[PDB]
Design a binder for this molecule. Structure first.
Ligand SMILES: Cn1ccc2ccc(-c3cn(-c4ccc(O)cc4)nn3)nc2c1=O
Ligand SMILES: Cn1ccc2ccc(-c3cn(-c4ccc(O)cc4)nn3)nc2c1=O
Ligand SMILES: Cn1ccc2ccc(-c3cn(-c4ccc(O)cc4)nn3)nc2c1=O
Lengths: 114, 114, 114
């Protein structure tokens, strides 16, 4: 899986351990190997949510499977919880785009998964 | 909705009120409530379009509905117009990916929109 | 087409010619005209792959057509090869999301491609 979070929170306010925590928590939530979860945090961004520049986050999660109605609700609670606790971003100011990728449409290690 | 624009134009060229203008203009164009529109502008990027590094922009608009043939043409006219007038980017050096997202695939406020 | 590569490799380690090389190699592999290929490289990112901070990359390729099983395998070999040779990123630390975009969902030049 691939998880990206873009935010206007400053870099200094991203705690040590955050990328590793996202990796472990996503492995637990998706069942996917932590070795093959990629995480990316982009602080200091020029962004607004509802016209306001208070802390916010725009995110994505891509996976081959493990994406669906009930799972995505669970991931949203998990990820909003982490962003609130670690980055002090309110959950009402977080968006996450989920993508159920076809195995043929993900490149990795010189090939795909199909 | 979520609107992102990445560009090689420098930060100092982005007008102070650009995020607010995008929010208001997208609410009018999509009919979506302004308090749910998120906007993100990323200047100073290392990019090329046709192998040239003249001003360009790569963008995305995600929305649950309000995406379609005629609507997307209208959004492109609006958004290319703003990028041309505000950032001095030629419309023929702008790409916008439109995504009609399922509500179950958009996380927000500890859940999804489904 | 649109190709984006986000990486933790530092900016100074991106060679002169990298964007031009990507543009030309993508035109050859896809058959798409190079004047319409956009490329974007984002170095110095805070990202991890498998919890590790060794060089890695998270990428996307969007195209109207030219996306499919065998084609995407070919693009992955090409792009991992370039990232390995030019940015010193191991292929097993590269993910690429492929998107076959409907022409009506690609904005350009004040309109769309359909
Ligand atoms: C059992 N096993 C073993 C190795 C593995 C290795 C990789 C994956 C895997 C990777 N993605 C993914 C990553 C980035 C994207 O942008 C989209 C999808 N989805 N699944 N899954 C497995 C897996 O399920
Ligand atoms: C009538 N009504 C009322 C409330 C509302 C509230 C929210 C939305 C809404 C949110 N998205 C969206 C945001 C971020 C994404 O990354 C993708 C999609 N699309 N629509 N729509 C409505 C809406 O249409
Ligand atoms: C034959 N011919 C001629 C002109 C042309 C002109 C443009 C394209 C074209 C552009 N995209 C694209 C760009 C950015 C995106 O974000 C998504 C898709 N895909 N194809 N294709 C052609 C093409 O195939």
């Amino acid at each position: 899986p691939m998880f990206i979070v873009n935010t206007n929170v400053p870099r200094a306010s991203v705690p040590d351990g955050f990328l590793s925590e996202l990796t472990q928590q996503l492995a637990q939530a998706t069942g996917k190997p932590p070795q093959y979860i990629a995480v990316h945090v982009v602080p200091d961004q020029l962004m607004a949510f509802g016209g306001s520049s208070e802390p916010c986050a725009l995110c994505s999660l891509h996976s081959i499977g493990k994406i669906g109605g009930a799972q995505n609700r669970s991931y949203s609670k998990l990820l909003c919880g982490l962003l609130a606790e670690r980055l002090r971003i309110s959950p009402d100011r977080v968006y996450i785009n989920y993508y159920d990728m076809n195995a043929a449409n993900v490149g990795w290690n010189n090939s795909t998964f199909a």
